[model samples]
Target: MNPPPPETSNPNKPKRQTNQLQYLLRVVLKTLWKHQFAWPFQQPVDAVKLNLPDYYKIIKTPMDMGTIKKRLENNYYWNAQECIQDFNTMFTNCYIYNKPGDDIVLMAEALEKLFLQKINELPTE
Candidate 1:
């Protein structure tokens, strides 16, 4: 038989909080990379797991708009409108998962808006 899952004082806490943070990062980075912002060195799945805390901070910080733009914008490789459409589709799909709490929902919205604005600013080529 498989070993029983280890016990914790709050088993759901880690699963719900940590797992959701990682999933949020994964979806964000994956969506960005799909649109030609492939600066993230590792694969999305592996990178998101390793970088969860930093990604969490970026998502939470209101001033991260500049960083998001720097990382996501690549004029030589990107198509702005297509990127925006893909980003919208990916974000909508992410919301179909287990409902995140208010704090997470707020941060996600902020990040989405920041990215969408950046994409809109890119030259339409």
Candidate 2:
């Protein structure tokens, strides 16, 4: 695989993820939350309740739509890239936990692409 990935270092000057006071971000996040394939990523993986004790061992930092929405409302992100990383985290965690062809894994695979497309269409510049 690739050498250790670079961790994103955010500066403090940019408080909000965008200039629209996060209005569009709010709407975009809401749309992602309701995406059909978003069910599995709606909440943090409950390792104990789900009976997969090793889940956390492999995935230390878990991301979910529920938590993302919480942070968005609280203005937790500095930029759209940070928000986008959370989505990638959600998809990556799903991929790591589930095997190939698993329904949940497949859902994340599709959702990731859609998310990217959605952001790409935005006039971020």
Candidate 3:
């Protein structure tokens, strides 16, 4: 008989460091606002109110860690990853480019755990 897949094999799990859906949503919202990418009705009432599936339809790219961190620092989340892709792509390129390597490494580790926790909290079918 074929063996079962590994414990970390769930496709929904992050590929590299941890991530959060809420964080992604917030980043998307801010970017949309900044770029005027959002439709008139797409303006969010607050961070938590930002629509997920709708925004995903607009921005085809995955979330980046640097944006998430900036949003978090703004005292944004009363709130609130897929996987590590190209290292450069994982963070807002300019943000990561200027930070020290050690800071980047540490942030990636923390973000990975956060992503895993967020994924675990999702409702299962």
TM-score order, best first, reads: 2, 1, 3
Cα lDDT tens digits, model 2, 12-61, are 53456575327435566777778888877777777666787788778767
| Candidate 3: stretches off by over 4 Å | 1-101
TM-score of each: 0.34, 0.78, 0.26
Lowest lDDT 10-residue stretch of candidate 1: 59-68
**Candidate 1 — which pairs collide?**
none
lDDT, residue 92, model 1 = 49
Best by lDDT: 2
Error of 1 at 100 (Å): 5.5
lDDT of 1 at 2: 21
Model 1 sits at a Cα RMSD from the real structure of: 16.3
Residue 44, model 2, lDDT: 73
44-115, model 1: which lDDT tens digit per residue?
212244544444333321222223233233221123343345345434433442157654444446556756
Of models 2 and 3, which has the larger TM-score? 2
After superposition, which runs of candidate 1 have C-alpha atoms over 4 Å from their true positions?
Answer: 1-78, 100-103
lDDT (Cα, tens digit) per residue for candidate 3, span 59-124: 333344333344343333332223223223443432333355665445544444454454445432
